[PDB]
Each structure stands twice: as C-alpha cells, then as structure tokens.
Design a protein around this ligand. Structure first.
Ligand SMILES: Cc1cc2nc3c(=O)[nH]c(=O)nc-3n(C[C@H](O)[C@H](O)[C@H](O)COP(=O)(O)OP(=O)(O)OC[C@H]3O[C@@H](n4cnc5c(N)ncnc54)[C@H](O)[C@@H]3O)c2cc1C
Ligand SMILES: Cc1cc2nc3c(=O)[nH]c(=O)nc-3n(C[C@H](O)[C@H](O)[C@H](O)COP(=O)(O)OP(=O)(O)OC[C@H]3O[C@@H](n4cnc5c(N)ncnc54)[C@H](O)[C@@H]3O)c2cc1C
Lengths: 472, 481
C-alpha cells in the first residue's frame, strides 16, 4: 500500500501548501502530509487570518462606538458589542480559506495525507494517523515545511485558560477586565490593540526599549508607541518579568522589575498573554537518525537551493533562517520547487516587507536608519506627513508619515518606512521599487493617482531626491 | 508682499507667471519657485486649488468615504461583525460639514505653501496683454501689470452645458450642486454615466435616493475603460440598486407644477420614447477646456476644434515663451495628469528634459468597489494589432479580501504574447486606487508579468491579487485560483 511520489511536502502552511501546488503545476507527482485537522498551517488557523479579522472588526467597533462615525453624520443611539458574533465572523473566514486550500489540492492533483510525518529513510516518509495506522510514501524528494511553535517563557506555564498564547488570545470568550501582554513585538501589539478596543485595560511589558520587534526603524517605533498610548494602550518598556502566579481566585499576579535591575513590583490581571517569540518546529521528524543537525536556534541549515546536507531533502519557511513571515515562506516554497526542476533560485530578504495591522498601520522594507549607520552607509532622508496628503485629509485619518532613506552617491532607495493609513498595501509598491533597484527620483516621477495615499510615498521620495516636497 | 489683492496695483516683474491655481497651476508655481524662478500665480476665485480642491476630487471623495461608512453601518455589514446598533440615522448637515472642513484645510494649506516658497499670489482675472505681459483685473476694478519672461496657462475646465436644459443648481444641478444638496432626493436622474456621474450617483443611492443614470453610449465609466471591466462594474452597481439606461439620448427636461422634473428620453438610434420623472436632475455629460477672455485670439493662438490649446512636447504654444498644461490641453482630464505636466513644464523652462508617458497615467473611480487602470485595454490592443495574453485573479480568492468579507471583482493583466511585457493593468475591487500605482511603477520600467509575480507582496494584502494575476499571465496559472 505505499504511495510513490516525486515530491513529498511535510506541512501545509504558507510554505508547504504553496510549494505543493507549484510542484504539481511543474509536473511533479506531489504529496502533502499534514497532522492537523485542516490545511493552511499557523497563518490560516491560529495566525495571520484570525488576527487580521479581529483587527478589522475591532477597528470598526471603535469607529462606531467612539467619535468617528458621529463626526461624519452617521448617528447611532446605542452601539453594543456581541463578541460571540464577532468571533463567528472570524471563524467563517478561516473555514472558507481552509476549505479553499483543500479544493486547490484537488484541482492541482496534490495528494493529501492526514497524519504525523516522520522521515524514515533518505527516500521515505511515513505518516502515522491518530489511530496509529501508517501510510508510507516512497519519494524522490522531501520538502520539510514543518513551521514554528510559540516560544515558552521559562517558569510560566501557558494553559490557554487564564495564561494564553496568541492562540488562546484569538478566542477569548469574554473581554477581560485587565490584560497583561508579555512582549511588545508585532503579535503582542496587534492582539493587545484588539482587546483594548473591545474594552480591556491593556498593558504590554517589554524587556527592550521599543515596540514593534526586530528591524523596525527607531523613529517610526517611537512615534507609533506615542500614538498607541494616546489610544489607551499602556506600555512598560525596559522591564523584565520574573514570574507569574495563578491565584486561587482565578486572577494572575505578575512580578516585574526594571530590565537593568530593581524597581520590583507586582501587577494583577485577569488574562496574561505570553508572546515573546516563536521558534522552529522539527519535533520527531527523524532528523537525528539521518544526521541532519540543527543550528543553535533550532533552524535547519540549508544551501541556496534550500537543500539540507542530504541533497534530496529540503527545508523552507519558519523552520529555516530569515524573517518568520507568511509571504517569505510562500516564496521560498515556490523557488525551492522551481530549483528542483532545474531553474534558478532567488529571494532577497532585504526586499521582504513587514506589516503591523494596527490602526494606524506600520509597514517597512529595506534598511532602517540604525542598520545603515551600523553598516557605515552615507544616506539621506526624505519625510512626508499624512497630514499633508489629500486623501488622508479628505478621509479625516491623518496620523503618521512616510520616511525614505536614499543613497547619497546614486539616489538609490535603501529603505521605506510607513506609519499611517494604508501602510500595509503601500509597502508593496516599495517592495517593487527595491526589487527593481529604483532611485528616489524614479518614484517621485511616477504619476501617482490623485487623491491617493500613495502620493505621500511619491512626495517623501521627492524630498529625498530633490531636497523638498511639493505639498510640505 | 506675497499677496496682491484689491488695492495692490503696482507693476510686477516675474520670470514665470502662472494663470490658474488648480492642480496643474499651483504645483507648477511651487516647483518653479523651488527651481529659482521669481514666480507669480494669478487666481480669480476666492480660494486656491482649482476645480479639484473646491468642487471636484476632494469634496466628492469625502462624500464617497462617508456614504460608504453609512452603508456599512445602516446595512448588513456591521451587524455581521458583532457591532450591534439600535438605530442608524443620517445627519446630512454633519456629513456635509466634514466635507467642507477638509476642503477648507486643504485650500488654506496651498496659501501657506505659496508663502513658504515665496510665490506671489495675485487675486484677480488674468488676461494676456502682450507676449511678455499679463494684466490682472481685480474685484474693485483695479488692474495690475505683470512683466514676465514666461507665461504658463493653467486655466482648467468648466462643465459642458446641455442644450435646452438650464442648470440652476436648485433642482437641475451640475456636479457642484450635487455635492451640496440639502436633502436626499427621493428620485434622481443622472445624465452621463462617466466617472463623475457614477461616483455622485452612488453617493446619493447609498444615502437613500432612487438613482438612474442615462447614457448615450453603450457602457459606463467613460473613455478608455476596458469593456469587460466596465460590464462587470455595471452589474455590481445594478445589484447595489443603481439603475442604468444605456444607449439612450435625452431629448429634453421640463420642471413641473408639482416641483418634479419630467425627462424625455429615446433610444440613441431612434424610437422607444419614454418619460422618466425625478426630484433632482444631475447634468454631467462632460467637462471642457476654459479659456474665456484670456487674450488668445489677439495673440494668434488658435484653439483646436474641442477648445484645447495646441502645445508641443515641451508644452510650448506656437508662441515659444507661452506654455499651457492641464485640463486646457489634450490628454486625460485628471488632477495628477495636470500636476505632472506642470512640474515637467517648469523643469523644461529651467533647462531640463521634458517627457511624460500618458500610457503610464492611471485612472481611478472611487466607488465601492473601486475601479482603476493604467496602460492599454483589450480593445486598444486589438485595434493596434498587438498580440497579447490575459491573466485574471478574483478578489474572492484573496485572503485579505475574504477575511474582511469584501470580495467583489478581480485583477486583469494584459501581457505581450512573445515578451511577457506588462501592457495594461485593470483592477475592479477593494483598494484598486492605491494598487494601480504599483502597476504604474512597473510600466515606467517596462517590467514583465514575471517581474511582478516574483515581488514578495506582503501576506495578507490585496496586492497579492495583483501578483497572482501577473503570475497567471506569465506562467499560465496562479497559485490560489
Ligand atoms: C498570531 C500570529 C499572527 C501572524 N500574523 C502574520 C501576518 O500578519 N503576516 C505574516 O506574514 N505572518 C504572520 N504570522 C506568521 C506566519 O503565521 C508564519 O510566518 C507562517 O505561518 C509560516 O509558514 P510555514 O509554512 O513555514 O509554517 P506553519 O504555518 O507553522 O505551518 C507548518 C505546518 O506543518 C505542520 N506540521 C509540523 N510538523 C509536522 C509533521 N511532522 N507532520 C505533519 N505536519 C506537520 C503543522 O501542523 C503546520 O500545519 C503570524 C503568526 C502568528 C502566531
Ligand atoms: C466632481 C469632480 C470630481 C473629480 N474627481 C477627480 C478625481 O478623483 N481624480 C482626478 O484626477 N480628477 C478628478 N477630477 C478632475 C480634476 O478636478 C481636474 O482634472 C483638475 O482639477 C484639472 O486641473 P487644472 O489645474 O488643469 O485646472 P482647474 O482645477 O480647473 O483649475 C483652473 C483654475 O484657473 C482659474 N482660472 C481660469 N481662468 C483664469 C483667469 N483668466 N485668471 C485667473 N484664474 C483663472 C480657475 O478659477 C481655476 O481655479 C474631478 C472633477 C470633478 C468636476
């Protein structure tokens, strides 16, 4: 009863499910193994999709319940939250998209095996199903796309009841009166903002001195934090958590101290969200028996074709180095299978954008000011505020700015940083610009439609190239 | 002094005198000053910013934004997200106030920018009175002479009148009256299903009006819209409740004793006479270049048959120090088009090269769903004999659109059959207006469909549908559809 395959993909997240589809489209007989009940991995089931749904719904709740809609002549007597219904909208979107992947596998002739995959030979994967039955796949190539898991906080046990990971935080059954978030990175600020909008008293505690995670430009990060604080989101930066105690009355006492030492205090909350990071997941995959060693951070080392040291066994996505993002994993999956078919394999991590889907949004691609300074690059700066952009002003939504970093000698765009309305979509024009090696002048001379937020991207590039914008 | 209004009548000298302060003129004036020219801008109206800021793009987009949110709240959308409201009521006065506040802030912004850049603002009616002379006539009857090396005509456009139907901005309105109606009309008829008419019709439809647009041609959305896009757009608007009578001519309109208006219509080719009644009639059959009392005849600058000023690739008229840009010359009558022409024109005066590729100028319709396009339509490629291939991706398969439950429409990419060069991009759906600028950048470089497919578009974003449609055009198949 074995299956024969050309390519066997272990995991169905952004990296694995896309790699499987593309491999089949290139003519490979393709199998995808997934241990969970649905396809789509972390992103679809407990990640990007449910978080963005709650961000959208909670933003609209805020617009209706607060001052915004009234200022536009949209008058409502009472605005009430129905959290069960809001969570239902989230779940409906997840179900539709997970079913969509199942259909795409059928359309492209990808064979779906439900079980826990273990590599049992250089050319063999064995999937064990929940009832113990096994399915053997004899296969020319193996693609490891096993993804990531939450990084635990030493001494604090997540139970998804009162101490939750992002998974528990996405499905709380009531708005907590008080919530503490450990970690002010992208995930923590997004989920904190959701619950703050819905009525919770929210504080994020962070060991470092800025919000938004690794690689965010410092000026952008400081201005972003100030805007979030005015919304009501509180922060304790430069602060260490030493422990948390689950109490008999169901609450949580969190012990904190200054990151540099001293200033010990205890803060109490109803829900504690632990979101200090994520890490590669390779458990019980068979790597030790094959001799595939991990790097000190748990990633699988791979070459430029994504081959492990065993050259017909590959790895992509959150299980290898680089930014732990869905579009990064997807592109690695595509190029890996194109390489298996003999083609070129290229991804430029400097051209991979990052987005924070708060309101205002934050998005960036390329290098920050801090990175350019460390590399000794001589650069110039152009800035344009959304308060001077016609679409933002017409919409009465004017927080933030576009900041462009350009090379002095050549006018090359080195980095683009956006805080404000539409940042998440706008960064993709910037990603194209970086991929093409655009100059600041090039972008300034695009005939951006009027009135659009994109005009602020043009104006910031004009300031960097010529020295002055038109409208500021 | 940087403001020369009534009572300020001493002769001025200038390097560049710009007539008009719309998107083309005010941007040209700022850029000219930044390039080192002593610059004057003459404007006859009480505020700066022209048609776009005062009675055009800005007030229309404000009402489109606000009426969309009214629809989300009053209809099914917010309830589907768990946002429960007892009553949702329209306060039209407050909605119009938000619009007016935005316009006032932006018009004041231009005044500040002129001051910051040392542009001299002359408030008056400019007339060219010699090859190097403009005379401004002010509200008090005073005159002021400007001796100037170069003249830049940026006098813009006006509404095209409809013979026999008198716009009074009461019950028979232009776009200006339609932007300031004092109550939601029970029934509205729109003459003209171009961009302006469809936008303003949709505003009032969302706010409660029964709206019908009557159009002589066979499609909605104006010149150059791709026909497949136009047909799919019309069907979506019809499902929203916006009615259309295409291939139909208006023969007249009568204001009646009960205060309503009877509009007489017929098939464009003849016959099928009918009368439709409305409370408000919006006349929006087009706009046309405005050059009244500018002095062109005395200078010998003749107009083309449509009223435009002929210019060369440097925007020079037949008199080589007199230039013209924007809605007063040929090309798409759009704000960003006028702005770009103004910038490159004054850069040329300063000695630079002058080049604009109109195939890279985008068009946007700010309905919901939005429509946006740049480059060539299928009809254009067929008429030019260009061999092309098609890639399409529906927003129903995009993760951001589906998560937001906002899934109308598609991205359509046209690529050259042999070379994979992007020839045109057409977007119907959420976020089209911002997304089309990624396409405009690609066209500036002569990028291929493959080039775009390989950009690492963020997940989840609407832009991924643009990537997927390019992948379908290049490789033959997308990932997610
Ligand atoms: C709350 C949250 C929000 C996020 N938001 C965003 C966002 O907005 N944008 C963004 O770009 N990224 C976001 N991310 C990150 C994104 O989810 C990941 O970068 C992405 O999912 C990684 O894809 P992957 O295919 O490499 O792995 P995963 O998505 O982790 O998929 C791995 C899959 O393999 C399965 N698996 C593992 N081992 C085996 C085995 N032995 N046998 C069978 N199956 C196995 C797992 O069950 C899983 O389905 C978010 C993450 C979280 C937690
Ligand atoms: C309802 C509506 C909505 C629109 N929406 C959009 C949109 O979303 N996007 C878009 O790109 N375009 C849009 N447009 C079109 C846009 O407004 C025009 O394309 C643009 O304003 C043209 O700019 P301009 O500088 O050439 O002329 P104008 O904006 O018309 O400005 C000309 C100026 O010159 C002044 N003037 C004229 N003659 C003289 C004189 N002799 N002396 C002194 N001053 C003089 C006028 O008073 C006026 O202020 C819209 C138009 C309308 C009517």
């Amino acid at each position: 009863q074995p299956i024969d395959a050309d390519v066997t993909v272990i995991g169905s997240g952004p990296g694995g499910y896309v790699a499987a589809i593309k491999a089949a489209q290139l003519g490979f007989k393709t199998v995808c193994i997934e241990k969970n009940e649905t396809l789509g991995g972390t992103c679809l089931n407990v990640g990007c999709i449910p978080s963005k749904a709650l961000l959208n719904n909670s933003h609209y709740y805020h617009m209706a319940h607060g001052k915004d809609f009234a200022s536009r002549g949209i008058e409502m007597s009472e605005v009430r939250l129905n959290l069960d219904k809001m969570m239902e909208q989230k779940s409906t979107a997840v179900k539709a998209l997970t079913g969509g992947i199942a259909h795409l596998f059928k359309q492209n002739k990808v064979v779906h095996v439900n079980g826990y995959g273990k590599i049992t030979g250089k050319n063999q994967v064995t999937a064990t199903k929940a009832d113990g039955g096994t399915q053997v796949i004899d296969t020319k190539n193996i693609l490891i796309a096993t993804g990531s898991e939450v990084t635990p906080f030493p001494g604090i046990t997540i139970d998804e009841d009162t101490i939750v990971s992002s998974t528990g935080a996405l499905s709380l059954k009531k708005v907590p009166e008080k919530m503490v978030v450990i970690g002010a990175g992208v995930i923590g600020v997004e989920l904190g903002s959701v619950w703050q909008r819905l009525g919770a008293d929210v504080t994020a505690v962070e060991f470092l001195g800025h919000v938004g995670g690794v690689g965010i430009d410092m000026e952008i990060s400081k201005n972003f934090q100030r805007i979030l604080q005015k919304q009501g989101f509180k922060f304790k930066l430069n602060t260490k958590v030493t422990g948390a105690t689950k109490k008999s009355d169901g609450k949580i006492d969190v012990s904190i101290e200054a990151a540099s030492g001293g200033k010990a205090e205890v803060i109490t909350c109803d829900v504690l969200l632990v979101c200090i990071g994520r890490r590669p997941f390779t458990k019980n995959l068979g790597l030790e028996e094959l001799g595939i060693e991990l790097d000190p951070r748990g990633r699988i080392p791979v070459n430029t074709r994504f081959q492990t040291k065993i050259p017909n066994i590959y790895a992509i996505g959150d299980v290898v180095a680089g930014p732990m993002l869905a579009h990064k994993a997807e592109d690695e999956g595509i190029i890996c299978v194109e390489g298996m078919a003999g083609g070129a394999v290229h991804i430029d991590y400097n051209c991979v954008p990052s987005v924070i889907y708060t309101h205002p949004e934050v998005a960036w691609v390329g290098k920050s000011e801090e990175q350019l300074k460390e590399e000794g690059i001589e650069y110039k700066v152009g800035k344009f505020p959304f308060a001077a952009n016609s679409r933002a002003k017409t919409n009465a939504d004017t927080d933030g700015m576009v900041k462009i970093l350009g090379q002095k000698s050549t006018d090359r765009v080195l980095g683009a940083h956006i805080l404000g309305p539409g940042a998440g979509e706008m960064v993709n024009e910037a990603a194209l610009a970086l991929e093409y090696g655009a100059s600041c002048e090039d972008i300034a001379r695009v005939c951006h439609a009027h009135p659009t937020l994109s005009e602020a991207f043009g104006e910031a590039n004009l300031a960097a190239s010529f020295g002055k914008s038109i409208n500021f």
